[PDB]
Homo-oligomer: A and B are copies of this chain.
Amino acid sequence: KQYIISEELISEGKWVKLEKTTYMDPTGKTRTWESVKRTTRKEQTADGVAVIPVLQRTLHYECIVLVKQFRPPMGGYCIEFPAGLIDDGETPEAAALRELEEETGYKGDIAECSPAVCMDPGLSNCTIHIVTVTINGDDAENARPKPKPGDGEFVEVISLPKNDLLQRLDALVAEEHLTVDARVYSYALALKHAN
C-alpha cells in the first residue's frame, strides 16, 4: 500500500549522502523522510557483516569476542561485534573471517550466516549479514592471535563469557565511559531470557 515517489539528493559527502525521500502513506497522502545512503553503491547484495565470534576452549567458559573502538559519530568508545564492509566480489562468509582476523587476530570457522538484516531502518538503508563464527582457542593458530588491523583502525579485543554476558556488560558500562552496541546488548539479553 506504501511505496517511494521520489529521492531528492540534499547533500553528498565523501562516504555518505543525505536524501529527501518522498513516499505514499496508506491513506493515499504523501509524506517525506530524511534518509542516509552510502555514496558508493554496493555491488554485493548487502553492505557489511557483523561477526558473532565464539571463543571455545577446554577448561574455560565459552567467551563472545567483542571490540572496544573509538567511534567519532558517538564521540566515545563503543563495544560492538567485529564488523566491516564487504569487499567487491567477496562472500559474506569470506568477509566475516577476514574482518575477524583483522580486528581480533583470530582465525575462525563459519557456523551460520544471517540473511541481509537492516542496521538502522529509520535512518539508513544499511543491511548486514550477522555471521556466527567459532574460534578453537586450544588450536595453536589462536595461541598468539596477531591482528592485521588495517589502516586507521584501532581495535581493543574484549572476550566475555557467554553465561555472564549481560551482567558483565552492565559492569563495563558503569566501570568506564563506554557504550554497548544495540545488537550486542540484544544478543546478551536473549542469552539471559533463554536459560
The residues of A with any CB-CB pair to B shorter than 8 Å are 2, 4, 10-11, 13-16, 18, 20-21, 23, 25-26, 31, 33-37, 50, 52, 54, 69-75, 77-78, 80, 83, 114-128, 130, 132, 152, 154, 162, 170, 173-174, 179-191, 193-195
* A173: nearest chain-B partner, CB-CB: B115
B residues in contact with A194, CB < 8 Å:
162, 190-191, 194-195
What is the CA–CA distance of A16 and B11 in the complex, to the nearest angstrom?
Answer: 12
Q: Which of B34, B37, B122, B183 is within 8 Å of A71, CB to CB?
A: B122
Whether A152 pairs with B31 at a CB distance below 8 angstroms is: yes
Whether B170 pairs with A115 at a CB distance below 8 angstroms is: yes
Residues A118 and B186 in contact in the complex (CB < 8 Å), given A13-B18, A123-B126, A162-B193? no
Whether A182 pairs with B130 at a CB distance below 8 angstroms is: yes
Closest 5 CB pairs between A and B?
Answer: A11-B11, A190-B190, A194-B194, A33-B72, A2-B70
Whether A118 pairs with B179 at a CB distance below 8 angstroms is: yes
Whether B125 pairs with A74 at a CB distance below 8 angstroms is: yes
Whether B2 pairs with A11 at a CB distance below 8 angstroms is: no
Q: Which of B2, B73, B173, B187 is within 8 Å of A122, CB to CB?
A: B73
What is the CA–CA distance of A122 and B173 in the complex, to the nearest angstrom?
Answer: 19
A117, A128, A130, A194 — most chain B CB neighbours (10 Å)? A117
What is the CA–CA distance of A45 and B115 in the complex, to the nearest angstrom?
Answer: 33
